[PDB]
Design a protein around this ligand. Structure first.
Ligand SMILES: Cc1cccc2c1C(=O)N(c1ccc(C(=O)O)c(O)c1)C2=O
Ligand SMILES: Cc1cccc2c1C(=O)N(c1ccc(C(=O)O)c(O)c1)C2=O
Ligand SMILES: O=c1ccn([C@H]2C[C@H](O)[C@@H](COP(=O)(O)O)O2)c(=O)[nH]1
Ligand SMILES: O=c1ccn([C@H]2C[C@H](O)[C@@H](COP(=O)(O)O)O2)c(=O)[nH]1
Lengths: 311, 311
């Protein structure tokens, strides 16, 4: 089945992973250099063995594809997956006049006391960002995230480059180029930025009218992140293939470090008892082609039949 | 044997490669996303099935490690592997007063007539570059090659960053970092530069006192380039491991496109009839540690017993 490489990776890290102490007084088990492949003609690799929310992936990917780094767009699609790094930058600032909450993320899931205070502070933030243009401009904007690396890379001359747009034009004119690359790794920013990008770089390749994509992912939360990551890049691959009029090939997912947190062990063991079902199919607006203008409604997933979400 | 992944890759491209017409009126056979691993504790992966010149690899790597982009240093070590792209930039200029030779590389191996004229023009160039500081400054310097990307990455603020030096300091202080990355891919230069780097990016990883390295290589001449490429990065891995006081782990070699030219087919078939021998061993100066100061003599290869070179 389409998703077996994900289960084999999880099982391999479980049975052969190396232990490393981790920053947040925990530990990981990891392996280096693992690869997964997914033939996208066999179905869409959204995990059946655990429910993965396709709507959040769609909206995040469309966000990136607009070159947008303002969480407002995500709030408008009911997507809170980027909230915390923005919440973090406002809560660290001068304009902020509520409870203390230094590292709200550690104290996050502990006492039910603070966890009611924070959830309302985040609920106010979200709403300010939604309706207050000036507040949104100031705290809604994450700065150096995928939207900017992919579509507005900042050059030394103060200008800005659309790597992905230029790449797509190359697929259309020079399909056999060996330079169909988009990087998110900027050696000038990486020493200071909040989040050196985990999805480091990717490359397309065309053969027999089919478009493949390989992603190099320097670091991977196998349980929480990977299942989202697989679906974003498989969707990216279909969307680019659609805009270029090509069929879809492989998605190849290559890791630097892939890890499992030492407290998440039983959740993934439980998942490894489940048996994949047939994979969903994707449908894209057959009459639209500029993916930089696609919206939620232009992307549909048929026949997705997952086991339940895990906690 | 240590080198079998190289022979399996060659054989896979031979038996399952996709044909693509190539720029220089030829064609390649290629595959996308292939990986090779080499456990560096089992020996040094310099190919036994074809002689590969370790001295040229050593000198090229030391060049990179100085942050140097002037071919003069290479000329002084009897290494001509970068000559042509420099020869190309002087022969295209105003100061040049010899025979015409537009695309000397196509006319290169054809008629023995021009091939005597060019070899002497290249022999004069090399000697000027060697003894004429001003000429060397002007035509010896390739500009954006590995030396500059790795050790003097140009920032927007007009400054310059030593990615590799900073990475090595991180290995020493934060060995379990998931950010031990050096990129050679600069989205601002890549649209114009002569040679968008083939050795796109690499990452280290440490476990149990052993240092591993993974390289992402976006494009690969399986017959001519790969055997050099494998030895440079395996040597890089040993050198960094030496400076940091670690043992050596895996070298993982991951490709975007890996190809074989459609006229090089029988050379690689002939090589596939040969049987690997035990791999050489590397010895490094046990009393020196700053690899940015290493020289030829600090690196020794024992017991390298190859079949003959191929043409
Ligand atoms: C699954 C997931 C889904 C949507 C968005 C994000 C993730 C995710 O894991 N991170 C993320 C980004 C950066 C870091 C980091 O600290 O470097 C992190 O731990 C998580 C996201 O922004
Ligand atoms: C095996 C090899 C050994 C040393 C140096 C070089 C190579 C090599 O293949 N190229 C190279 C670089 C760039 C291109 C390019 O045209 O992009 C190329 O064809 C070869 C080198 O500079
Ligand atoms: O799409 C993503 C983005 C991030 N991560 C994880 C990997 C790491 O656990 C964490 C970042 O910590 P560092 O590796 O960057 O130090 O984010 C994912 O799994 N998938
Ligand atoms: O270390 C290297 C450097 C380059 N190449 C080859 C791959 C391609 O044949 C060629 C560059 O052409 P493009 O792929 O860049 O277009 O250089 C290698 O095999 N090894």
């Amino acid at each position: 089945m389409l998703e077996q490489p994900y289960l084999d990776l999880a099982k391999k890290v479980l049975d052969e992973g190396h232990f490393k102490p981790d920053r947040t007084h925990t530990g990981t088990y990891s392996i280096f250099g693992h690869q997964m492949r997914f033939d996208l003609s066999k179905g869409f690799p959204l995990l059946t063995t655990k429910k993965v929310p396709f709507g959040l992936i769609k909206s995040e990917l469309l966000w990136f594809l607009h070159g947008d780094t303002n969480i407002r767009f995500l709030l408008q699609h009911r997507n809170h997956i980027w909230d915390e790094w923005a919440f973090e930058k406002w809560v660290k600032s001068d304009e902020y006049h509520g409870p203390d909450m230094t590292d709200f993320g550690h104290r996050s899931q502990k006492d039910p006391e603070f966890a009611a205070v924070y959830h309302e502070e985040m609920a106010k933030f979200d709403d300010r960002v939604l309706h207050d243009d000036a507040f949104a401009a100031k705290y809604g904007d994450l700065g150096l995230v995928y939207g900017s690396q992919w579509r507005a890379w900042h050059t030394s001359k103060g200008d800005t480059i659309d790597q992905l747009g230029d790449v797509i034009e190359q697929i259309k004119t020079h399909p056999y180029s060996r330079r169909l690359i988009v990087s998110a790794w900027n050696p000038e920013d990486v020493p200071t930025m909040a989040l050196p990008p985990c999805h480091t770089l990717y490359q397309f390749y065309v053969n027999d009218g089919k478009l493949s994509l390989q992603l190099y992912q320097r670091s991977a939360d196998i349980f929480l992140g990977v299942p989202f990551n697989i679906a974003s890049y498989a969707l990216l691959t279909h969307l680019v293939a659609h805009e270029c009029g090509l069929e879809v090939g492989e998605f190849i997912h290559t890791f630097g470090d892939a890890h499992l947190y030492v407290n998440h062990l039983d959740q993934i063991k439980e998942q490894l008892s489940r048996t994949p079902r047939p994979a969903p199919t994707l449908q894209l607006n057959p009459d639209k082609h500029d993916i930089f203008d696609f919206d939620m409604k232009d992307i549909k997933l048929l026949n997705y039949d997952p086991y339940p979400a895990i906690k």
